[PDB]
Each structure stands twice: as structure tokens, then as C-alpha cells.
Design a protein around this ligand. Structure first.
Ligand SMILES: CCN(CC)CCOc1ccc(/C(=C(/Cl)c2ccccc2)c2ccccc2)cc1
Ligand SMILES: CCN(CC)CCOc1ccc(/C(=C(/Cl)c2ccccc2)c2ccccc2)cc1
Lengths: 236, 236
């Protein structure tokens, strides 16, 4: 219903966090192998990234969350295929690439590619493409707690100086703003341990559309849902 | 659609956390004053509490979240009216009453009534009636962080002993289990800073029904939604 020219008339969130899910369900739905669904999801990452760069979005976060060895090794090579394919098309769009999570659970060849893509994009000031690999909201909160405790132990930080502001700075999204919008696909209505502190005041849009089928139109429909939320009477 | 005898056939969550919202919208909808809507919400708390005690629920958490002086003072006296009216009917049902949040933002007369109701219900082992007054998820997380930092400063706790388990114990819901189900009313699809750590793996049910209109039937329908979620193929 909502077209591109209707969404550009409306407010564009500055930070959108999408939960990409349903790659496997989409492979079964199409009688394809699972790794094919993960490949298609990798391509949807790019379509969405370009669309969000067009719309004025400033930060865009992506998260994708047992599996046999083959599928795990295929997944841990998708970042390299994604960067060896679309990194020139992203530096051309002034997009900064960053990664949040535990990088130590990636193999070296993948981390080198990731780090190179980050460093070739640090001098940019356009949209931010934020990837969550091996990311746990609870483990982020506990690690911020533990670093704060380290600083208290050394004596460089007094316990009465800790507040919501200082605590946000110790999260993996420190130089970032909280997501104005959260999107979740595959039909699940949960958070599944993603950015718990950050989605406190975030509008949640849920949708049964699987992540490979989430192209330009469904993203626009999600933005129309958001914008209509913004323009609801009755008060609060 | 789902009757009581259909819901009792299915799985009953052990911990349900409801976000009571829309008391004001319900007062306007019925041309009543706002304080009347808060009174009706107070009565719905009891209907729901009895229904959940019937269904086998073990813990039931309730949260209700600027206003003119009159409405604030009326609200801070609703706990006493609620306890002076329904506390015998709750001790008769073996319900334990507890309160989480900042109690120091209540006046003394209210805190004395609350504390008395807690102490007259400590010797019970039935359902738990958990009230969130002046409760902030972010402030709960930061306070747990700060107590942990205090224990590290004194030397009674080493920083390598802190984990998701130990961190849960420092939240206001320490002796409690995470909510299997979260319900939110008034049509809003957000969390609004409620139990961020706890709803990590919690099924969220949203409903436009205002909290005064949330009687027995809508609670059953929410439980049917949950139970149908539990019995969905396609996998994960
Ligand atoms: C098997 C290892 N898992 C943990 C189980 C963690 C590592 O898996 C992942 C590997 C790649 C990605 C990923 C993309 Cl672009 C992807 C997006 C949508 C659907 C599927 C893959 C990516 C590529 C480059 C940078 C950042 C992200 C996400 C998780
Ligand atoms: C004005 C003060 N606010 C903060 C703005 C905090 C204090 O307000 C509140 C006062 C009472 C309650 C409340 C009940 Cl039962 C209630 C439930 C549903 C709808 C309206 C009221 C209650 C009674 C006894 C024990 C526990 C809860 C909740 C918040």
C-alpha cells in the first residue's frame, strides 16, 4: 500500500535494527538447500542496505540468529563472499561498515576480511552498516558490568558516577543511538536476546515474511506501519 | 474462541508478566473521569489474579506505566484500597504478595500497607502476585551492576565470578524465574523499559484491548495465542 514516495513524505528513523530470520524456512519452502537460503539472505542484506541508504537512514543494524559442520563453515565464509562482492558498491555509497559481537568466535580468514572492510570504510561519513555476529544481549550487559567493575577496582571510576548514561557507553553500541525501529521476520514474536537495553523505547514491527522474501516492498510496508504509529490519536 | 476447558488442556506458563495500560484511554472511551479508569483497573487486577491462580500459574507480575497532583495522590492510595478490600480474599487463596521497584517513591502510609500485605503473605506457598511500582528495567540493570561493583571493591567478589547466572541474582526478580509470557495492552507494540533482561526469551502477545476491558475471556485468548505458538511446525 505505502509506496516509496509515500514513505519519503514521512519520518525516516535514524536507526533501524532488523532481525533477519527464516533463511532455513525459506529454503524448505522453495525445495532448495539451506546454504542456498543463506546465500539469498546475504543478497537481501545488500538490497536492504541500498534501500536504507537511499531513504536517509543513518545506522542500520543486522542480526542473523545447532548446525552440521558444513553449514557452519559455509556461513563463516559468507562474510568474505559478501565483502569480495559488494564492498566496492558500498564504499561507492559512502557506507561505513562495523561489526558488534564476539569476533573471537570467527576464524582468522573471516576476521581479516571483516577488519579490512571496516578499515576501508572508517574514512566514510555516510550510512552505518552494523553487523551482529555471535551477539548476545545478556552477555553484552554482563561484560559492560564487568568492565565497570574493573574500573572501580583500579580506582579510576567511583561507583556513584555510574548511571544510565555512563552504562550505555560501556555497551557494544557505544557511539551509537538506540534503535528507533526494530523489525523481526520469520513470524516469531520474541526478542531472542538481541539489544535488550537498546530496544527499551523501540517500536517493534513483526512480520511473517521470511528474510529472503523481504525485498523493497515489505521494508516500505514496515516503515508505513512505523509512520502510522507515529500519527495515532487517543494519546498515551 | 478458546474456552477455559481448552486452555486447561494446554500448557500453563509458570510466570506471566502483563503490562496493564490504557486506563486513561478507557476513561475517555466511556466518558468517565480518569480516576474512575484507574479504579476499574484496580478491580481487573483482582479478576485476573483469581483467574491466574485457578489456571495453575505460579508467578504473576503486574506493571502500570506526567499527571496533576490529584491523580497522583489518588493513584498512591489505590494500593491501600486494593489491600483493604481484597487482602482477605487473597490470603484465602494462598497468594503471596510481593513488590518490585523503588519503594522510596511511595509515601509512608502506602508503604506500610504494602509491607503489611507482604508480611501477612510470606507464610504462603501459592501463587505470587508481583507488583511493579516505580520500576525501570534500565535502572534495575544499572543498580545490579553497581552492587556487583561494590562487592568487587570490598573484595568479597572476584570479577571472573560474574556471569549471566550471578547477574540474574542481582536483579529485583532474584528468587524468580523469567517470564514465559509477556502480555501488553492498549495497542502499543513496545516494551517501555520493562524487565529488559527478563523477556529475552519471552513470547510477546500484544492486544488492542484496554486494561479495564481485559477480563476472563481476553486472558484466555492470550493464553490460546501462546499455546498455539508452542504447537507450530516449520521448525526454528
Ligand atoms: C556459523 C557462525 N555463526 C554463529 C552460529 C556466526 C557467523 O554467521 C554469520 C555469517 C555471516 C553473516 C552475514 C550475512 Cl551478510 C548474512 C546475512 C543474512 C543472512 C545470512 C548471512 C555477514 C557477512 C559479512 C559481515 C557481517 C555479516 C551473519 C552470520
Ligand atoms: C502515582 C505514582 N505512580 C508513579 C507515577 C506509582 C504508584 O502508582 C500505582 C499505584 C497503584 C498501582 C496498583 C494497582 Cl492494584 C493498579 C493496577 C492497575 C491499574 C491501576 C492501579 C497497586 C496496588 C497495590 C499494590 C501494587 C499495585 C499501580 C501503580
Amino acid at each position: 500500500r505505502y509506496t516509496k514516495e509515500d514513505i519519503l513524505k514521512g519520518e525516516i528513523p535514524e536507526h533501524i535494527a532488523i532481525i533477519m530470520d527464516g533463511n532455513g524456512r525459506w529454503a524448505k519452502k522453495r525445495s532448495l538447500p539451506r546454504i542456498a537460503g543463506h546465500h539469498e539472505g546475504m543478497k537481501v542484506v545488500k538490497r536492504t542496505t541500498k534501500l536504507a541508504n537511499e531513504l536517509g537512514v543513518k545506522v542500520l543494524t543486522l542480526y542473523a540468529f545447532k548446525r552440521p559442520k558444513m553449514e557452519v563453515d559455509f556461513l563463516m565464509k559468507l562474510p568474505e563472499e559478501f565483502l569480495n562482492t559488494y564492498l566496492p558498491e558500498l564504499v561507492e555509497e559512502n557506507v561505513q561498515v562495523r561489526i558488534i559481537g564476539d569476533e573471537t568466535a570467527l576464524p582468522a580468514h573471516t576476521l581479516r576480511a571483516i577488519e579490512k572492510a571496516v578499515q576501508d570504510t572508517a574514512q566514510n561519513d555516510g550510512m552505518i552498516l552494523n553487523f551482529a555476529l555471535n551477539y548476545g544481549g545478556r552477555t553484552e550487559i554482563v561484560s559492560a558490568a564487568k568492565s565497570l567493575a574493573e574500573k572501580v577496582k583500579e580506582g579510576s571510576l567511583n561507583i556513584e558516577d555510574i548511571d544510565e548514561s555512563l552504562f550505555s557507553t560501556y555497551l557494544m553500541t557505544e557511539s551509537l543511538q538506540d534503535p528507533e525501529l526494530l523489525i523481526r521476520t520469520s513470524g516469531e514474536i520474541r526478542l531472542s536476546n538481541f539489544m535488550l537495553w537498546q530496544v527499551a523505547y523501540s517500536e517493534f514491527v513483526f512480520t511473517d515474511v521470511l528474510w529472503p522474501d523481504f525485498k523493497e516492498d515489505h521494508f516500505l510496508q514496515a516503515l508505513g506501519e512505523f509512520q502510522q504509529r507515529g500519527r495515532r490519536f487517543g494519546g498515551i
